[PDB]
Amino acid sequence: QADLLKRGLADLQEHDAELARILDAEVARQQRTLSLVASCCAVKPRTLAASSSALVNVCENVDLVESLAIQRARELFGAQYAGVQSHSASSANYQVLAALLEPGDTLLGYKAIGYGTTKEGLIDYDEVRRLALEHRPRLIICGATAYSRVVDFERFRQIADEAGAILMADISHIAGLVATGRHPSPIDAAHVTTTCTHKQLVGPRGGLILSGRDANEKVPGRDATFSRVLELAVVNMMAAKAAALGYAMTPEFDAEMQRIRDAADVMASEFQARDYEVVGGRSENHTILIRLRAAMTGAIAETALEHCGIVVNKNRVPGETRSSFVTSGLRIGTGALAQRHVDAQGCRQIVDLLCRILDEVTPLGESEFTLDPALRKQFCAEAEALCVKYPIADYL
Amino acid sequence: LTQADLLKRGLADLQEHDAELARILDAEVARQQRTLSLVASCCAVKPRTLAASSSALVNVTAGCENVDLVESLAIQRARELFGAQYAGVQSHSASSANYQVLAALLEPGDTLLGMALDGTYYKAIGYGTTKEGLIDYDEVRRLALEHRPRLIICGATAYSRVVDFERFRQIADEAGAILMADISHIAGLVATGRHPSPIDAAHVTTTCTHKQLVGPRGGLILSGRDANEKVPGRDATFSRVLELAPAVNMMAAKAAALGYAMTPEFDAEMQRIRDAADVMASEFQARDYVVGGRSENHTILIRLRAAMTGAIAETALEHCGIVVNKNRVPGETRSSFVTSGLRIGTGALAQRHVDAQGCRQIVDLLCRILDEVTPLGESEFTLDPALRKQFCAEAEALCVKYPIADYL
């Protein structure tokens, strides 16, 4: 009875055709646009099919979809506990934070204590240690968004276990690599793990609460296991979650994760061969942070690059002398490129186009620039040509 | 590519490769076709609105132009559909919309006469059942003058009669308060002119997009004649403050849902709700069982009799394939959990294109259940062995005779 949705598409085509033009135009736009932004990805069509189930009209099938997602999350991540009802990863974090209430909290950036990065582009774990032994936090939150290196969840847990703290990990940005083993997992390192289904699991907007070896071990104080306390925080997106969790166990997802992982290495190496500095000097994960030219600001780069059809994200660089709104670097993720099945040659072509656009941009201040309209049109056509040579495969 | 082909491949992909899930989702649509639902606000989203929910706009966090185009279509449709001068369509929830408007218009610690009928803000109960099943507007006024709330909220889940939004505005203006209207349960009737509109009477009106408007799980924020008027005590207009001065797949579906309600097929389905309620209210009275003289909306509240308990009534009926909700009556001698009444909504029956003859037969089966079940306790239901088998089969047979039309 998938006829329901197919003939539902037919109702839109006949009666709401205006709306259907915009729906068709976005699919084309997402496919004529080159996307190197780290956490943007196109959700797999199967997951889009489950997101429009008749389970919106809501009952034992609502528990079946829930039980299937819980089982699938536990297999993918090796979780002894799993919770799947979060409508966002932000909610998954706050729900855990609410279950665990005491002023002390250490986080990367309640009485919030903050840590950051070393002046050379790494998490200052020794600062995490010093802050933990001083303020005796309730939990320490680990997990970074723009980091280009493997987060040592084991190190964080060593620090926490000497400061009597709980370790929470947001693996939202590296979830697929953690699931496929390419990135070390925090499932047993962290007491509790949170993740987003959409970013790197190519699924719906939502959240997963997970725990491993500490799931049935007692919370520090409060005479309960981590599984209870988390579960005492009590849908279409359930169906889509289970679809995404299922595809994430397929070998096709393992390949997409290696392509994320391959493209990161060739692109970072190709930036270096053009004397553009990658801050880690290497790429682990799906992200490459490039330190931008002397007069080039990250704000100028992203605005000019989008006008040429490439979307990238400005990011702070180690030793940043500039504002947050106007940076000195940019961040690129190989996520949506893996969905485009870009070979090593294509990744080198993208670095070529990107570095060529920047060499033609004459910065005027820190958020203004000049790019000759003709050169912009020519660059925008090279980008769309690369989009055609490497299309989004599952969208075809 | 096209949205349809992406989705047809998506549906095909979720049958070769993920089949366990496909059976569960396909099982549920069958369950809803054999279950006769008399619940007030449960409905089945239209397939046209459902297909819009598989937009690739989900992948959007200018790349925001098409999301702006979808949004503007929803704003303009919402404004025309309800006759509103301001609209906001980005609410994940009806509750999210209500919370968002409350935060925008109330300062921390402000008092709201929510008339909720069941820390940052203080809430006055507002009751509203005192007038023997009517809203106690006179207490709303008394409390409003005594507590001077910044906000008064109107809109009832289980009311079976028209809410006098104008009367609340009279109360609100006398007590120097803002009026919020939650019309989630009567949205289509206000839409189609059957229930009086709150757009100009209330400063801000909110609505779910699923309960009566047959659309996605979500919320909508509205304002009418008070849109360009500044919030009392503040230097900004209601429209700017309500603008809070990213799920776009739901926003495409809201546009589709708002468009369909403008079509006359929605109007007929609204008349079918209003019509079926009158027939079923009439049959209940002629079988000597309705709070209020008649239904002026989609809800019928029935007082169970002869020590019938709303909890056992609802429990027994599900075993016979009929889904209803227990609901308090004026003069609840029993607990809140064990009511002495039953609540029925005709939204699901309009989607089954049931004739007046069929509505009476459903009441017939319903009363025939209650005339037979023998409450032994206030919760332990009894007297349903093989009689419940033929009764379930008879309900499923009415489901067969009257199918959900738009679900083919």
Features:
globular; natural product biosynthesis; homodimer; 15 helices; alpha/beta; 4-stranded antiparallel sheet; 396 residues; 2 domains; biosynthetic protein
* Strand numbers in spatial order across the main sheet of chain A: 2-8-7-6-5-3-4
Q: Overall 3D geometry of chain A? A: globular
Percent range for β-strand residues of chain A: 5-15%
- How is the biggest beta sheet of chain A arranged? 7 strands, mixed
Give the total of domains of chain A: 2
Radius of gyration of chain A: 22 Å
First and last CA, distance of chain A: 23 Å
Number of helices of chain A: 15
Q: What is the ordering of alpha helices and beta strands of chain A?
A: HHEHHEHEEHEHEHEEHHHEEHEEEHHEEH
For this entry, what is the oligomeric state of its chains?
A: homodimer
What share of residues of chain A is helical?
A: 40-55%
Number of strands of chain A: 15
Class derived from helix and strand content of chain A:
alpha/beta
Give the chain pair forming the largest contact, with residue counts: A-B, 70 and 66 residues
PDB class: biosynthetic protein
Keywords: natural product biosynthesis, benzobactin, serine hydroxymethyltransferase, benzoxazolinate, biosynthetic protein
Assembly: dimeric
Entry title: Apo-structure of serine hydroxymethyltransferase (PbzB) involved in benzobactin biosynthesis in P. chlororaphis subsp. piscium DSM 21509
